[PDB]
């Protein structure tokens, strides 16, 4: 008898995080069997080498309501059917949440993989802090990426026992998606030039202080000769108007399209630093151990910076130029980032879930927690 463990993923950041999971239950088919439910990302299932065994067509004009009803009623019908001993739902998704109730009606057991983030605002995001909240009473067992997001869910009377600092498996995803061999004409003709990546989808950011933030860039460029910029610029046209001013015509400044998630990991292999205001990245570059500058006044990733994986930097011109030059001309301070330990995960975030799953199902030895 197997641990049949269905995974379920709706969206492609969750395909991406979910699928090295999968990948580790594949690794050990002679204690799990798994089963892949997709409720949306077949190009990220190719790389991960991963067949979907059941593949719902929920619909896109649809209230929250629908969407939420359609999933339940979906995966409480795929739950019945193939009664796995566990099901895994990611995150905060509205996909998560409804497979999770249904996985309760079934009474199954459920799994949280990325369990307990909160912002404890209701309303803020909306709505994946309730999702995760709703997720976080129904689950049996929580895959908590951070010791914070334990402590959140133990501050919430959640049984100790049943919480497991594993890291994020978004970083595991990584052993994957970085190629051996990445092919790219930018990459290619890099030569010795330090690549220094830059991406901001916030919209606080997005607004006035994109003509400061491409200024300062600009200007890293032109000072710094050995550098070179990748822009992969937003869908936008003010934006690309800012950035075809600003750093459209010289030869070191890289103004291409949104690169995908995948791409994106292949480039950030081989830069020297990166400027955003996302939150993935925060958590992935240092996975490749890429210095972090963070366009942000605020963060919800406060162990990437007491890590010194991350820099605060916010948005100011003079702010990113200094910060920039630091890390540029003070080979010290780069490797000090580069090699500070990823508070957010080694990349066996996988393993460590498996052998929690194991743990419960086998009751053999119960991992301890990942250590930051």
């Not at 379920?8 to 090295?20: L, N, S, Y």
């Not at 990584?174 to 830059?198: A, C, F, S, W």
């Not at 830069?271 to 939150?279: E, I, K, N, P």
């Not at 991350?310 to 980032?337: C, F, P, Q, R, W």
Request: hydrophobic fraction near 40%; avoid cysteine.
């Amino acid at each position: 008898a197997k641990i049949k463990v269905m995974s379920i993923f709706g969206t492609r950041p969750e395909a991406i995080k979910m699928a090295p999971l999968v990948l580790a239950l594949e690794k050990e088919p002679e204690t799990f069997e798994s089963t892949v439910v997709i409720t949306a990302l077949d190009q990220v299932l190719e790389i991960f080498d991963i067949k979907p065994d059941i593949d719902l067509d929920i619909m896109k004009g649809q209230t929250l309501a629908e969407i939420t009803s359609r999933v339940m009623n979906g995966i409480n019908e795929v739950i019945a059917a193939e009664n796995p001993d566990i099901v895994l739902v990611h995150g905060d998704t509205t996909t998560s949440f409804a497979a999770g109730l249904a996985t309760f009606y079934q009474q199954k057991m459920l799994g949280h993989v990325e369990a307990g983030l909160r912002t404890w605002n209701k309303y803020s995001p909306f709505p994946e802090e309730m999702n995760r909240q709703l997720t976080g009473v129904m689950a049996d067992i929580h895959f908590s990426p951070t010791k914070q997001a334990k402590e959140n869910l133990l501050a919430e009377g959640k049984d100790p026992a049943t919480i497991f600092v594993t890291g994020n498996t978004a970083i595991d995803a990584l052993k994957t998606t970085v190629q051996k061999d990445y092919h790219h004409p930018i990459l290619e003709n890099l030569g010795d030039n330090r690549l220094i990546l830059m991406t901001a989808h916030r919209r606080e950011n997005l607004g006035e202080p994109m003509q400061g933030m491409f200024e300062a860039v600009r200007e890293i460029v032109e000072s710094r000769e050995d550098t070179e910029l990748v822009y992969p610029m937003h869908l936008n046209p003010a934006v690309r108007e800012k950035a075809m001013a600003i750093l459209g015509g010289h030869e070191r400044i890289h103004l291409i399209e949104p690169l995908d998630a995948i791409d994106f990991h292949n480039f950030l292999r081989k830069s020297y630093l990166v400027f955003t205001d996302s939150g993935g990245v925060q958590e992935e570059a240092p996975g490749m151990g890429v210095p972090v500058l963070v366009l942000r006044d605020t963060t919800e990733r406060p162990e990437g910076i007491e890590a010194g994986t991350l820099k605060l930097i916010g948005t100011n011109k003079e702010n990113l130029i200094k910060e920039a030059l630091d890390l540029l001309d003070n080979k010290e301070s780069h490797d000090k980032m580069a090699q500070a330990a990823n508070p957010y995960g080694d990349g066996f975030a996988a393993n460590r879930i498996l052998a929690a799953i194991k743990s419960h199902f086998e009751e053999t030895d119960r991992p301890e927690d990942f250590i930051v």
